[PDB]
Every structure is written in structure tokens, then in C-alpha cells.
Ligand binder design. Sequence first.
Ligand SMILES: Nc1ncnc2c1ncn2[C@@H]1O[C@H](COP(=O)(O)OP(=O)(O)OP(O)(O)=S)[C@@H](O)[C@H]1O
Lengths: 121, 26
Amino acid sequence: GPTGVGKTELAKALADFLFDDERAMVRIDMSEYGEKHTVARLIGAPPGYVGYEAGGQLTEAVRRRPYTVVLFDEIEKAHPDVFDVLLQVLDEGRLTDGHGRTVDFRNTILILTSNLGSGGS
Amino acid sequence: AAAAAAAAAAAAAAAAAAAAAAAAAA
Ligand SMILES: Nc1ncnc2c1ncn2[C@@H]1O[C@H](COP(=O)(O)OP(=O)(O)OP(O)(O)=S)[C@@H](O)[C@H]1O
């Protein structure tokens, strides 16, 4: 919808209600991802490359604490290739990373806010 | 009357190895 209506505020109140906390939510930006090669923060690296023992941001964040709410703030700025990753998060509830360990989002909340329109009906 | 009869031994010392971790150069 419009800006300044309180989207992130509603998401943080929802995270407040069923954790009594504020750091259980996993906010990841989408204003970082203008470049096409910068996708691998949330997957990892294939075997034979530099960061391999670490893994991924969005996978190691959910291998522990498997009840979090996740946030994708301003998903318009992401160019149309990040949309192909979370295409398979939805409809399956699984994700794979560099080691080949399928993490399962079967009991998490997914909320992704946008900014399209802004004035129309 | 008693002799000593010295004995042998076997020593082990292994070796580490490194991985090279290529970089995709972008
Ligand atoms: N319905 C509301 N009730 C109470 N406070 C609100 C409400 N809407 C907005 N606010 C306040 O206004 C500020 C902005 O709200 P947010 O929803 O956090 O903005 P936002 O989601 O970052 O908007 P964008 O589009 O992502 S820049 C917050 O710090 C809230 O305290």
C-alpha cells in the first residue's frame, strides 16, 4: 500500500504476540540485492569456494530456532532473479544449501512487504 | 646374575594437509 501506514509495525506486533520478544523475527533486507551475483548470502557457496564451512545466512538462522517469523522488507527493489529462490520456499516448505541439508520451513510465518501502486485503488 | 636386555620402540608422526579454496573472481 502507501508508505508510513505501519507494515513493519504490524509484523513486529505479530512477532511480539507469540514470542513476548523482539529478536525472534528474522528481518532480511531487499535493498541490498540490486546486483545479480549477490544472491548467495542466503544459500551459501558450492563445494570448492571460499565460504564453505560457514553456510548461509537464511539457512543457519533457521536450523536453530525453527519457529521464527521471517521478513522480506521492500521486495520491489530486488531485480527479477531473487524471486526465483523463494519461489521454491513456498509450495514445498524446503530449502537446500551447500552441504545438501534440506531445512524445512513447515511451521514458520512468511511475510513480505511491498510498495507497488501507491495511490491507486 | 641378571642381564638387562634393552628393547626397541616405534615412533609415529603424521602430516597435515591444506585445501586451496578457489575464488569466483567477480
Ligand atoms: N497503524 C499504526 N499504529 C501505530 N503506529 C503506526 C501505525 N502506522 C505507522 N505507525 C508508526 O509509524 C512508523 C512507521 O511505520 P512502519 O509500518 O514501521 O513503516 P514501514 O513499514 O517501514 O513503511 P515502509 O513502506 O517499509 S518505508 C512506526 O514507527 C509506527 O510507530
